[PDB]
Design a protein around this ligand. Sequence first.
Ligand SMILES: Nc1ncnc2c1ncn2[C@@H]1O[C@H](COP(=O)(O)OP(=O)(O)O)[C@@H](O)[C@H]1O
Length: 899
Amino acid sequence: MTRWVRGIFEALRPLETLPVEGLIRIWAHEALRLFQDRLVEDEERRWTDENIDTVALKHFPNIDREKAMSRPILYSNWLSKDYIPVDQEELRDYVKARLKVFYEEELDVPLVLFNEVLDHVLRIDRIFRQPQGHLLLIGVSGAGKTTLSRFVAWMNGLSVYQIKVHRKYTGEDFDEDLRTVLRRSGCKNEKIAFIMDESNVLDSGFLERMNTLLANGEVPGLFEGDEYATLMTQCKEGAQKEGLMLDSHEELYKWFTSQVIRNLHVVFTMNPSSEGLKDRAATSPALFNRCVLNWFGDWSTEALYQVGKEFTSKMDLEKPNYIVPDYMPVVYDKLPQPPSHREAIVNSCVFVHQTLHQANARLAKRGGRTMAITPRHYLDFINHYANLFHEKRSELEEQQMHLNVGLRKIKETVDQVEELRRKVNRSTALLKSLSAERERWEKTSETFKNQMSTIAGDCLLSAAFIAYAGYFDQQMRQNLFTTWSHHLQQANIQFRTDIARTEYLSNADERLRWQASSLPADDLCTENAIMLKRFNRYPLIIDPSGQATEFIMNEYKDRKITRTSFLDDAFRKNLESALRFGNPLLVQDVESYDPVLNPVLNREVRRTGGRVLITLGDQDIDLSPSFVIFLSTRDPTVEFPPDLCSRVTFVNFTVTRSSLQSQCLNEVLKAERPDVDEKRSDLLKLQGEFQLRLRQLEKSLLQALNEVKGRILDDDTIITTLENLKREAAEVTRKVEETDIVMQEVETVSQQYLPLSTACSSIYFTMESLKQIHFLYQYSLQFFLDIYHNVLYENPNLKGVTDHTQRLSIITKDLFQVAFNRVARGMLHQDHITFAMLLARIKLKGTVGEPTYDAEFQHFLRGNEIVLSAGSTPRIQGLTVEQAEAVVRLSCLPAFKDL
Ligand SMILES: Nc1ncnc2c1ncn2[C@@H]1O[C@H](COP(=O)(O)OP(=O)(O)O)[C@@H](O)[C@H]1O
């Protein structure tokens, strides 16, 4: 209430003749600034707005709507000398005008201005106006709390200062930095907008220093001895050059403290996690005394839609023929009218973001180990969408112009043939072959026109998959992809169905090179390699095994990738040399993440300077363009700080039940029924790879055409190539026309081999969970892989049998038996029955002839623990109390009503 009265009084210093409406407007503005910015939920904010309006009307029942107008009540002293209220649009234009100069100065990164930005900027400016302005910007990473802070601090002419934090950064260094910032604040009279983040704190002593820096503005145990005398020298000089009389030592120190009071603004940016705030309050009470905390909520659907619309402007998404048959909105308010498919693309992007939010909520509800999606992920997703759309359109345009060049070359060949004619059989053969070529190539042209319909949707789905997914397992990746596909089809945005992510995002040669460089054939590994190839945020590999580390080591052997770690004392030494040379650096053990990497991960290198210099620590080091840093770990799952979570692309190699199911299905299809596996590999190659080989034959034909210069005496040299091209075109046509028969029998074969895969996954994860029973029962994935390879390629029972239906049964029985034999051999002779009947339950789930009997198993396991004492008296002489109670509990079971 004191701040309320102070703010109202300040707003009325130079302003006269204000009506009652203006006064209640200022009252409401101050109430919203001091009572609503601190709320965390939107419900609290709207309740505050409703209650302020109802109290205003109750205590002032004879006022005009001049009290409220537009709910964006904003006051700015930028447009006029006084603290006059301003309109949304005028302030937006002025902020854009100032942002032009801001971009000219530094940070050329574009910032789309939404309603939230203008409000946050005005709040931070209001806090900056008062001499004791201190901020606690609590908001999710990527919201731009730091960016807005710097923008407004520059806009008010405040020299921003930041602490460069690393693992070796000691408390004495913090005291020296505080001495420097206070010297700049008091001496030379510099308005410092000194800022910090939660990552900028590694020792509480920082927090007790800020306690006295905020509450009193003077740090007593900072300036001692020589430092104190030097400080008094500089500040006594500053008093003279600022026209201030020199006094005794104590009075001069007091004047310096007052100068720091009026020339220092400390800003805190914090994780919205309230648990951290609970003891942040305890460590420093001044965080709730001198700091006006400003809660930054997650970017709203309005903000996400505006970001998507503004950034996706360079791309050409204008499709004149588009139909909207259903009503699937997200923004709900701006341009809901039938779109030009660009609004549809942006709506799909924001729906993808909401889809991740819903998936995260569901994962947290039905389990844990859930990571939080920051708006920086949206910016990464938008950049991925733009780059991938550019690539996938430029490549098709260049191959289309190649086809046009080939057509013109064939026309020129026709002209040469007409000149030559005026052997006849050779002429007729080449004439019919070239007519067939004309038909095939006009078909190619119409196909090229067809892919323009699907490029937008396919690239959107691929970018949403690569930029967002990567931490989730195979099942959740598939669920997200199918949800995105269903929504995009429902939005009538044309995307090609049955899209192979691996084949669409990579070519044959890169995939085979990956396979050579120690990469498993699992589709999860291929997708992870895809994410590792193209990326904006430097990867953070999650892998319990060492397969990914050795794979990426092999991938960059030529580039001289150096292996270091955070635990290594020479980590900075090993990283500076790699940065200067331009060599990739793989840093393992990200558990003790070094905060010195924040500038590198944020890619905040200042390109404004002549050479591209990064401010890594105190020193400035030039950023080599080939500096590709990598992060990795050795644990399956661990919680990461959210600030680190928003600067890296989580690529996860951790196995799961669905991953084991897919691997076992692929392995059994490779071993049993290799024809279906070959036909599916041909299907995967049908997306681009076969077309790429056809283009290679096309360019070989083009080379031969001017190699022979239209020879007619020896025409077979080109007739062979033409015949091969015709045969390959016919083969591709047969493969495409069989895409209805195929994936109709392929799906049947796959679902036939599904019980084996699910049984394998269940058996492996039961073996993994066997750690609970006894500390000695520890089994690796390699052990189960050996078991499964043995039961496939080494069974003695499969030597003679060849019928697939009998071979599957024999393989399943052999797998069960061999798994039991290999596991029980290292189990005490009291758990053999336990594992055996666990495998029996797994098989009973696998078989279909009888129900699962889940109620019976639940009873047999725990249902006898139900509490009841009615009818517990034995009725027959041949019965006891415990047996009578067991009779009652079994009579509870539906199968035993009459017992
Ligand atoms: N209004 C905005 N529009 C677009 N991008 C924005 C906006 N505000 C911030 N950003 C982006 O946020 C990134 C910086 O986020 P950062 O300041 O590190 O966030 P935080 O302080 O929440 O951790 C940059 O990519 C910047 O362009």
